Design a binder for this molecule. Structure first.
Ligand SMILES: CC(C)(COP(=O)(O)OP(=O)(O)OC[C@H]1O[C@@H](n2cnc3c(N)ncnc32)[C@H](O)[C@@H]1O)[C@@H](O)C(=O)NCCC(=O)NCCS
Ligand SMILES: CC(C)(COP(=O)(O)OP(=O)(O)OC[C@H]1O[C@@H](n2cnc3c(N)ncnc32)[C@H](O)[C@@H]1O)[C@@H](O)C(=O)NCCC(=O)NCCS
Ligand SMILES: [Zn+2]
Ligand SMILES: [Zn+2]
Ligand SMILES: [Zn+2]
Ligand SMILES: [Zn+2]
Lengths: 374, 374
């Protein structure tokens, strides 16, 4: 019915920074060559979406935000070969073009067609598929999932198992994969190792799941909020520490606990002043520290490079280091085989039209993840 | 034979900071259990030795410095099994005890018995083998090579090829191995890659040698002293750039030269304000930057963690990442098999008693390496 025609639907438009989302009637254009229009099924609310609201993730406004989601293909443009109408799909906020120097590299995943480094808020062709009362609305990270229908470039969508429960596997689009890959792909946590995870939100919980899957002997969760500890232990933490409970700095506490430093540390907080702590607690000769979270308006930190000169490695990644289009379908197949659970991450489910309530849950710290259902 | 008896010989004692070396008659005690007394044949003058003079590498004084050297075993203490009198040896400023968690780790080489982290200036047993008119003199890094005879712990000496030229292979004791391993061991430079080397002293030249050995397609030398360029190009640099020649910051120049960043970058200068440049010039998704050189009085550097979040790796090492006792003999065997050259690193040779003239050459920037011969 709808192929080749404009669809009128509802979307959450952000007209201006520091305002609530507005549920608007929007027009969604049909897909052009190598583009895919998706009926959204479920979308998560992630911190990066809230950073758009706060104006600390700078991207052009007005905008349809949302980047962690799952849906069903409504139609495909000319030349699309990797998905068909009816297929379940996850939009990829980190694309996989397959052609740039990063996509061709065995260890790179931050494809040069991404819209995260210098956001333009468009499709790959420099235009938008959304209007509201005639006014063009920007895309966000090539995804724009806070809409009943979106249009994405082929390089920014993966086909997934037809039997997938979309209201769970949407987390594979951002938070789960970010944390899980930080452990299994970026750090390559080893069997028998000791890990420290700084921050026990949904992404840090996913980091734990990854360390556990990799066979870590010890997984030390670190959070200032002791309410986060029970879920951390449920998904794999062997122990949890609150820096506020100790009369010395937590890097010293962790180095003592680990008999001279941990094998792997992960920084999973949108804060600067915890990053050098996380680096320093790994063993000085062979420890590895991974940066997963950063504040959005990120300033410089202060550190002593002798922390690296002894043999430490410090690295980060986007999207868990996973080549996105190769990996997302594989992560879904693993979920279907019960290799990991997503239910512990999902604290709240709301209809889409309650998007503002979902953000209020995020800002208050009450949610791990809220999933919006269309 | 001198075995089992005190040796009276000459050594260069540093009595106080910021003074010339004094050539003194010293008494060298015989080796105790698990110790080895070595007749020095040649010793290099390295920047770290001069930092001892400056008072910026803190180690107890008075001291016999010197850590890059080669000699012949004069005698062995009780229980020594890995060297015999008459053997050619290189003292190891980074020990290999073989027992600590680092020695046991596949990737670690900064053995916990080292005297670099918190120098005490003694033998492993907490005592000294040196006296100068009855006054005890400190050891340096468990080596003290600025003496006609020294005593070292067995975990700080390696047996090398009986046929090796000691006046060349002494470089394997610090400068050569540091730069070469930074490339082949720490960074693991790949065939066809683009490397950037910051600092074209002896260690930066050895980095270049390692990158060439690894099959790098482009090796960009960076130095503020253009007199260092010709030798850099002799040993493998494809081009050299002087930051003083450019209006833009050199990370921008190098990113443009390399069409979006280099594969590997190396920081080989005792200065802080070049380290973030070196990290930033590597490709943002898969670039690796290695810290080889640091200033001794090292303060905190300012950096933005967003440089790592895109996928860059930042790491450092001591002694090129080589497990020292395992690797030094193999490096000497490679040299004897003509797998690399050391002559390009040796710019000056002086008799030992002209040590202060050798430090003048280092301080002025005139030398790459001076070797002292006994
Ligand atoms: C932080 C990231 C990974 C989101 O993680 P997550 O959703 O788990 O964050 P969340 O705020 O819910 O959790 C953070 C946790 O840190 C804890 N925390 C806060 N301060 C501290 C502290 N001083 N010590 C320990 N824990 C702390 C909080 O109590 C909380 O439990 C994300 O926002 C981020 O920064 N990503 C960077 C990469 C990126 O921008 N990718 C683009 C797509 S999102
Ligand atoms: C710097 C190290 C590696 C010694 O290297 P090397 O002998 O090659 O040093 P050297 O001073 O000769 O050369 C440094 C070169 O940097 C160049 N340089 C100086 N400033 C700049 C600049 N702004 N940009 C580019 N090049 C510069 C100099 O002109 C010089 O050619 C060493 O001192 C060090 O810091 N090692 C750290 C590890 C350690 O302490 N190990 C213990 C045993 S040494
Ligand atoms: Zn790409
Ligand atoms: Zn996200
Ligand atoms: Zn050891
Ligand atoms: Zn040295």
């Amino acid at each position: 019915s709808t192929a080749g025609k404009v669809i009128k639907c509802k979307a959450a438009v952000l007209w201006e920074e520091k305002k609530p989302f507005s549920i608007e009637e929007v027009e969604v254009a049909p897909p052009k060559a190598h583009e895919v229009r998706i009926k959204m099924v479920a979308t998560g609310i992630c911190r990066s979406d809230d950073h758009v609201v706060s104006g600390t993730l700078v991207t052009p406004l007005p905008v349809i935000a949302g980047h962690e989601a799952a849906g069903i293909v409504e139609s495909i443009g000319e030349g699309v070969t990797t998905v068909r109408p009816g297929d379940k799909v996850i939009p990829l906020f980190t694309p996989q073009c397959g052609k740039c120097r990063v996509c061709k590299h065995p260890e790179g995943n931050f494809c040069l067609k991404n819209d995260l480094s210098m956001p333009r808020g468009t499709m790959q062709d420099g235009t938008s598929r959304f209007t509201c009362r005639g006014k063009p609305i920007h895309h966000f990270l090539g995804t724009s999932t806070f809409s009943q229908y979106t249009v994405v470039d082929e390089i920014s969508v993966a086909k997934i198992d037809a039997a997938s429960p979309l209201e769970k596997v949407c987390l594979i689009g951002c938070g789960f994969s970010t944390g899980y890959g930080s452990a299994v792909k970026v750090a390559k946590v080893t069997q028998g190792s000791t890990c420290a995870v700084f921050g026990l939100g949904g992404v840090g919980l996913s980091v734990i799941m990854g360390c556990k899957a990799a066979g870590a002997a010890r997984i030390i969760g670190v959070d200032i909020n002791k309410d986060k500890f029970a879920k951390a232990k449920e998904v794999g933490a062997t122990e949890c520490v609150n820096p506020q409970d100790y009369k010395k700095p937590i890097q010293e506490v962790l180095t003592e606990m680990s008999n001279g430093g941990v094998d792997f540390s992960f920084h999973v907080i949108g804060r600067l002043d915890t990053m050098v702590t996380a680096l320093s607690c790994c063993q000085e000769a062979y420890g590895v520290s991974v940066i997963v979270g950063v504040p959005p308006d990120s300033q410089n930190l202060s550190m002593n490079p002798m922390l690296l000169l002894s043999g430490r490695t410090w690295k980060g990644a986007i999207f868990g280091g996973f080549k996105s289009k190769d990996s997302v379908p594989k992560l879904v197949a693993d979920f279907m085989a019960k290799k990991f659970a997503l239910d512990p991450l999902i604290t709240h489910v709301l209809p889409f039209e309650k998007i503002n309530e979902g953000f209020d849950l995020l800002r208050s710290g009450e949610s791990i993840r809220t999933i919006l259902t269309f």
